[PDB]
Design a binder for this molecule. Structure first.
Ligand code: K
Ligand code: K
Length: 204
């Protein structure tokens, strides 16, 4: 059994690079996330996402030894790719994610009540040492959240409006889920998924 945190961030304002505003959004998000240790980083192959990830990491106090992995599965919906096709890509990404986390961190590391949500950057992950950062695109992230919340067994905390849960993500909007996974019949499955916060933009 392994529990890990996933922080999800939409790229900054924009294979185009970030705008100047984009850079500043990403730096603000980096400063917001600076005291978090990301043990793993995953990012779409698109420059706007890579630069956002680079800026977040360049502002981080703990994650210097963490390598950024580019994953095409995180690319934006092809504008024409169906919503189901995008969801399938997220399902494939999750499969990859569980396997990677289990292989690297194993089952002797972090082995359904409300997480502690204080409106701070480390909400729900204070005591969760394994923490992955995913930097991706707005339509993909929206579809990914629907999948996590609707299609899978999922917990959502007190006072979180469904309107917010399903809202479109702002540039550098931040979301967080906590996953618990275990190997059932040789296949890795999530036993619990806990939503913490969705599309947070306090840093803007
Ligand atoms: K559900
Ligand atoms: K709830």
């Amino acid at each position: 059994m392994l529990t890990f945190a996933l922080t999800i961030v939409r790229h900054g304002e924009t294979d185009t690079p970030l705008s100047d505003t984009g850079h500043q959004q990403a730096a603000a998000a980096g400063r917001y996330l600076k005291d978090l240790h990301f043990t793993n980083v995953f990012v779409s192959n698109l420059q706007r996402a890579i630069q956002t990830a680079e800026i977040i990491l360049g502002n981080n106090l703990h994650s210097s030894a963490t390598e950024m992995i580019l994953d095409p599965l995180l690319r934006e919906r092809g504008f024409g790719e169906t919503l189901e096709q995008v969801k399938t890509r997220f399902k494939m990404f999750l499969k990859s994610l569980f396997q990677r986390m289990f292989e690297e961190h194993g089952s002797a590391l972090s082995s359904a009540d409300q997480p502690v949500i204080a409106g701070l950057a480390d909400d729900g992950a204070q005591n969760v040492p394994v923490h992955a950062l995913m930097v991706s695109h707005g339509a993909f992230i929206r579809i990914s959240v629907r999948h996590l919340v609707e299609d899978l067994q999922c917990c959502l905390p007190a006072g979180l409006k469904m309107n917010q849960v399903f809202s479109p993500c702002p540039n550098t909007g931040i979301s967080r889920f906590i996953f618990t996974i275990h190997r059932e019949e040789s296949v890795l499955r999530a036993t619990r998924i806990q939503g913490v916060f969705i599309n947070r933009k306090d840093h803007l």
